[PDB]
Nucleic acid binder design. Structure first.
Lengths: 90, 63
DNA sequence: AATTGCTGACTCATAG
DNA sequence: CTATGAGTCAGCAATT
């Protein structure tokens, strides 16, 4: 946590009495811990994109279904005018 | 060796798992695209139906 | 350069 | 058994 959240500069401030193999080792551990979090964000973004698409779809299906009902209504009304215009031609 | 074999199989299973996740996202995105095509076509149809309906109504009323 | 962020693949543990 | 969750590293491209 502090090993990940510290800046390089403040980190060295604490790596004063450390060996060279030890500094390499500690910096590898910071990289590993940071990668652990990168992976978690990566995968979290994907689930959130899935959810956002699933939601968008749900809503679109709803909107489409109400547009289809407006279309049928309106095509009926138009056809009710057409029969009384075909009936006058008769 | 039963170590090696389980790894080979699991590795193949991970690969399939990743491919399947990607395909399902593609498929969902396509469905969503299809619904937007359909919605857009329905809005156009509504505007035409309104126009067609009022043309006929006004003809019948004027004559 | 070294460090950072990301994402594809491999692995272990375990869910299904 | 295989499918998945999550940690790890490989490797690229951006940043400091």
């Amino acid at each position: 946590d502090q090993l990940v959240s510290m800046s390089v500069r403040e980190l060295n401030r604490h790596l004063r009495g450390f060996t060279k193999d030890e500094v390499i080792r500690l910096k590898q551990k910071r990289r590993t811990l940071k990668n652990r979090g990168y992976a978690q964000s990566c995968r979290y973004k994907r689930v959130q994109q899935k959810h956002h698409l699933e939601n968008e779809k749900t809503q679109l299906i709803q909107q489409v279904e109400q547009l289809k009902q407006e279309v049928s209504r309106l095509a009926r009304e138009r056809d009710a005018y057409k029969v009384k215009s075909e009936k006058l031609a008769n | 060796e039963k170590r090696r074999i389980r790894r080979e199989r699991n590795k193949m299973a991970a690969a399939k798992c990743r491919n399947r996740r990607r395909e399902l996202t593609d498929t969902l995105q396509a469905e969503t695209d299809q619904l937007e095509d359909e919605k857009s076509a329905l809005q156009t149809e509504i505007a035409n139906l309104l126009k067609e309906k009022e043309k006929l109504e006004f003809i019948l009323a004027a004559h």
